[PDB]
Amino acid sequence: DHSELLVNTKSGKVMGTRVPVLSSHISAFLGIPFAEPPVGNMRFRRPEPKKPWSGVWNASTYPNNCQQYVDEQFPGFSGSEMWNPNREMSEDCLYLNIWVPSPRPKSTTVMVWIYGGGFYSGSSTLDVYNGKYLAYTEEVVLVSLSYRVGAFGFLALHGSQEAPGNVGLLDQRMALQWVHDNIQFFGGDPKTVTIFGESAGGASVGMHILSPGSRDLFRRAILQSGSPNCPWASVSVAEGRRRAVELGRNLNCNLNSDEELIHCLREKKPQELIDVEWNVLPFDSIFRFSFVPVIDGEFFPTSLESMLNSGNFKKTQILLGVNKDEGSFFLLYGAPGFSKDSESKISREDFMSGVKLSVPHANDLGLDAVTLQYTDWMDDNNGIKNRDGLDDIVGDHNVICPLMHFVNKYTKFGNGTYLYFFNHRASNLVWPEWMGVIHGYEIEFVFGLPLVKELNYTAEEEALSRRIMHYWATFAKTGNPNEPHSQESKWPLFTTKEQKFIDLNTEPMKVHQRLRVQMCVFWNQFLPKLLNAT
Amino acid sequence: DHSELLVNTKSGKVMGTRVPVLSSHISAFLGIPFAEPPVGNMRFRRPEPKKPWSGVWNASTYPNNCQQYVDEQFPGFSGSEMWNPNREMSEDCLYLNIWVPSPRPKSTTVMVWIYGGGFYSGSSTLDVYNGKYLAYTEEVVLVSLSYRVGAFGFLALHGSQEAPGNVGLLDQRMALQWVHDNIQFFGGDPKTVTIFGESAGGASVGMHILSPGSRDLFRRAILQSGSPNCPWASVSVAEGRRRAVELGRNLNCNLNSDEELIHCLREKKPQELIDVEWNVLPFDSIFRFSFVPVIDGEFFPTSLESMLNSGNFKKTQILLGVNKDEGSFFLLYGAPGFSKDSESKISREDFMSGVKLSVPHANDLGLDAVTLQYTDWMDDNNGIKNRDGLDDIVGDHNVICPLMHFVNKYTKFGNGTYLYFFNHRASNLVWPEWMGVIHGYEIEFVFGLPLVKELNYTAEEEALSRRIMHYWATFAKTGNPNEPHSQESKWPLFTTKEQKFIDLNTEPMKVHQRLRVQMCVFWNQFLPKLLNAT
Numbered sequence A, B: 001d002h003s004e005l006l007v008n009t010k011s012g013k014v015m016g017t018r019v020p021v022l023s024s025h026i027s028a029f030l031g032i033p034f035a036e037p038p039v040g041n042m043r044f045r046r047p048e049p050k051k052p053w054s055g056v057w058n059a060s061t062y063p064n065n066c067q068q069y070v071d072e073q074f075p076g077f078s079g080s081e082m083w084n085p086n087r088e089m090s091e092d093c094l095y096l097n098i099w100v101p102s103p104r105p106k107s108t109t110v111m112v113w114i115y116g117g118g119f120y121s122g123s124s125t126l127d128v129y130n131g132k133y134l135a136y137t138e139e140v141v142l143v144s145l146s147y148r149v150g151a152f153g154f155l156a157l158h159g160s161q162e163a164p165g166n167v168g169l170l171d172q173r174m175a176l177q178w179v180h181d182n183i184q185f186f187g188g189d190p191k192t193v194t195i196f197g198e199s200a201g202g203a204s205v206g207m208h209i210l211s212p213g214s215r216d217l218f219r220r221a222i223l224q225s226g227s228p229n230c231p232w233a234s235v236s237v238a239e240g241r242r243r244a245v246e247l248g249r250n251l252n253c254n255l256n257s258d259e260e261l262i263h264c265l266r267e268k269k270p271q272e273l274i275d276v277e278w279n280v281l282p283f284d285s286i287f288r289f290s291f292v293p294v295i296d297g298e299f300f301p302t303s304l305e306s307m308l309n310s311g312n313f314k315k316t317q318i319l320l321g322v323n324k325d326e327g328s329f330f331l332l333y334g335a336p337g338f339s340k341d342s343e344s345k346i347s348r349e350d351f352m353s354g355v356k357l358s359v360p361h362a363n364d365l366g367l368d369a370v371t372l373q374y375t376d377w378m379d380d381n382n383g384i385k386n387r388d389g390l391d392d393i394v395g396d397h398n399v400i401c402p403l404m405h406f407v408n409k410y411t412k413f414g415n416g417t418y419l420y421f422f423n424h425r426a427s428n429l430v431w432p433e434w435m436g437v438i439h440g441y442e443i444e445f446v447f448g449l450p451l452v453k454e455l456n457y458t459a460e461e462e463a464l465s466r467r468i469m470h471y472w473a474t475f476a477k478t479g480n481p482n483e484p485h486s487q488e489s490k491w492p493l494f495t496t497k498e499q500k501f502i503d504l505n506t507e508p509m510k511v512h513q514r515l516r517v518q519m520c521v522f523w524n525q526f527l528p529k530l531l532n533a534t
């Protein structure tokens, strides 16, 4: 061994770069490869492990991002562009990043970040996902992995071995294998790995908790605004198949056989697939994505709900929660009457249209049941109530109530559950007020961006961030976000009986119970009974 | 003509009695017959007009009450016993009563009271229906009629002319014919007759508004806690038939023919019919009565809803409303967990049982939709919330929301609608607190009982009564409860657009809008869509 930035791993030697952070410095190992490039004839295939290398792998700069749809809905606007790829896109994108305290620890808590983006987009290299502040502040080794998205990660022709489906989840698993196998050399403790992720990354986390092939590779889990059972996070094999055939149909492919389709898809340039990807969705919908995980009988051995019911999943601790206004983004982008630069007061006709888009799988009785549940009939033309009410519909149905269902089932068999409700709107949000506490805007607090003076958060936002980071890291380390014997207010355990949770904002902690139960009894029990009967 | 108490009518001469009232006196003509006795072979038949008589009909004492079930659920208790017959019961019961100011007016406003009692009970002769205070205070001629109830009034074998159904409504109509034809001789103006009634009497009123054969006999209408479209106030001819056959089955009748059944029923003593009457109901239910009006194609030429929709009804003014706690009585008497001498805090199991009884016509999805709509899921074991919530279910479903549906339909074609919500609980109510503002307890205010010092109301209850009586009488006289040009607060018209109504209590009038719309959109639009689809 020669120096702090040189680490010898089972895959070979790796050279990092020293990086400044809040008037100090740490080590960063960026762009380490964990799989072979899934290119050419390996497109759609399950990843192969990276063949070890001779020499020293230069890990001083961020890798490429995976091939993905790029949001151009608001050119030059930082609110949307902070989510897009900031590196060149390539099919050769299976790399991970590690931020390691200086001096190098010996056996410290490890946190592994799985990006969101609907399984059609996302990047490990975004500014808001910079691990240095958290690694430095809380003395954890901070990994961020990557995984194939879109058709590249999730095209599913079940029964074929060339495009089986789920390969993007297999990418995440392989990165988690490589951390298990190598993080000791960077000073991380492989027995104390926490996986954490937002939205589709949150759901991915839940998916590794359920899947037998992933459970042993990590110790505990954090799910932010995402659950494995979300209505958008998986499709049946039959539906997967249908969409893969439709995709081939949009590219003038031979459709006689799987082999024929797959060969045709493999000839196409990445951007040809990306350009027609939204054409395969079966309904006019929002919060629905084309290529997502498939309930295949392998990665997921039975239905998600039967695994949840029988306790067929990893038993450990989990920490998880939601933001107050999970739906607004999807309404802005996809529903009539919402725009970025107005208050988006919504007529009754646009309300009804929104409901339809929001609950694509519903018969008319179903739509009426939603509309009744969320309409104030003493004031049914209030444009603000309609706007806010639709915002709640999208969030409740897609994020909050699935998550609350996951929590209630998990908590029966698990070993400790901590639940939060993040409802602070950041003082410098570039998005309009009506969107509230938007999908994804807790991430900046989890990653410590408010400690950076130049980014212009308030002091109370710095303090909130420090507190979240310390809850997240203490939980990763011990299985409990609370420091043993400290004087702070205590985040209580969520239990089947009492169902407690806390708000996460700049005000003194307040504990509550039964998060959105009224609406989630509607979405989790009544509405699905109504649609089964009709 | 000889004196004030002698009136010559088209049916013959009649002798009244002078009666004291609030330190003054008026004339009362009690027990005037308006039909032939519907006895023997006329049992179940449509009434015949009373054959005129020679001599002077002694009208100094109250007539008999019709044969009816008698409530013995609380022996000696005045709360329940004030509703029972206070005269001998007889099949010979078709009489009316008239209170006439002294000195005799020439052409004054006439109010005709139709008693409630579920179409199975009721009496014109009850203390709370004493017309003297209103006649005297407001200078109206006050009639109260009677009509056959139970099987005697409503057994229905459609196609037979011996028991056609609806004969009790035909009794009311005949009394209204006789008032039309004779009230001029008592100083009433037949061109200014208001029909008014409570509960089944309220529904009866609505029924005379709809029925072509009744419309011309009165000018305007007041409906208290009752509407023609109530779920309990009518049955189909097929259902009528079924219950009449079941009734005969309970009495070991020949069932081969209508003639056979009817002859067998006509041999039975009244009390034999009354003793088995509750055995014919098709469900385990509350707020459902055995022998009610039947949608026959004659009295009602089509379905009530198609008449309401097409405007096939009398166009005039109406004044109508509800009490705050319409359901409590029926829960007390029929639902498990409610008792007279406890607070009746209701377990979740008794809640569910109550829902079932309350909505007998509902499939399980239906029951779930009710339960969801009325359960606070943050506090689903609060026994008070469950009790109150079930009280609202029974009242909303049976009284308030049918009435609100009637109002909204009527108001499209009618000539002025005044809507109230009576929510004052009388200071001397003998019933327990949990029952709130009980079905029927506005009646005492409408009839002026609070002006009688001995009955122990408060002064503000005297004032409320005087104000209600004057709203009721001014509306009967002019079509508007408000006195032209006075300084009091004005009861506004209910309109399709603004839907205003007022509270009726001891506090200063407050105007509101859209009475129980949230719950009535559930009962009037959603739930029936749900049960049609399943």
Ligand SMILES: *[C@@H]1O[C@H](CO)[C@@H](O[C@@H]2O[C@H](CO)[C@@H](O)[C@H](O)[C@H]2NC(C)=O)[C@H](O)[C@H]1NC(C)=O
Pocket (backbone or CB within 6 Å): A414, A415, A416
């Ligand atoms: C998490 O798991 C451990 C058990 O593996 C729990 O601690 C045990 O609690 C039981 C019952 O209180 C005791 O009988 C054992 O002695 C405990 N074992 C240890 C090693 O402490 C703990 O209760 C679980 N936590 C939760 C929240 O379920």
Ligand SMILES: *[C@@H]1O[C@H](CO)[C@@H](O[C@@H]2O[C@H](CO)[C@@H](O)[C@H](O)[C@H]2NC(C)=O)[C@H](O)[C@H]1NC(C)=O
Pocket (backbone or CB within 6 Å): B414, B415, B416
């Ligand atoms: C009740 O009916 C009368 C009509 O028969 C209404 O009074 C009429 O109103 C219209 C339109 O305002 C006028 O053109 C007529 O000259 C009025 N006729 C009379 C005789 O006044 C009155 O509007 C109706 N009231 C309600 C509440 O609908």
Ligand SMILES: *[C@@H]1O[C@H](CO)[C@@H](O)[C@H](O)[C@H]1NC(C)=O
Pocket (backbone or CB within 6 Å): A058, A060, A061
């Ligand atoms: C590694 O390559 C980067 C270019 O991305 C370069 O800036 C850096 O100097 C290289 N480091 C070494 C010492 O190889």
Ligand SMILES: *[C@@H]1O[C@H](CO)[C@@H](O)[C@H](O)[C@H]1NC(C)=O
Pocket (backbone or CB within 6 Å): B058, B060, B061
């Ligand atoms: C009428 O009969 C009643 C008995 O109910 C009696 O009290 C009254 O004196 C009689 N009146 C006359 C004068 O016939």
Ligand SMILES: CN1CC(=O)c2ccccc21
Pocket (backbone or CB within 6 Å): A083, A115, A116, A117, A118, A122, A198, A199, A329, A438, A439, A440, A441
């Ligand atoms: C909600 N944030 C978080 C996130 O993953 C994302 C993807 C697209 C647009 C916005 C996003």
Ligand SMILES: CN1CC(=O)c2ccccc21
Pocket (backbone or CB within 6 Å): B083, B115, B116, B117, B118, B122, B198, B199, B329, B438, B439, B440, B441
């Ligand atoms: C509600 N009041 C009014 C009413 O008509 C009636 C009948 C039976 C028991 C109580 C009653």
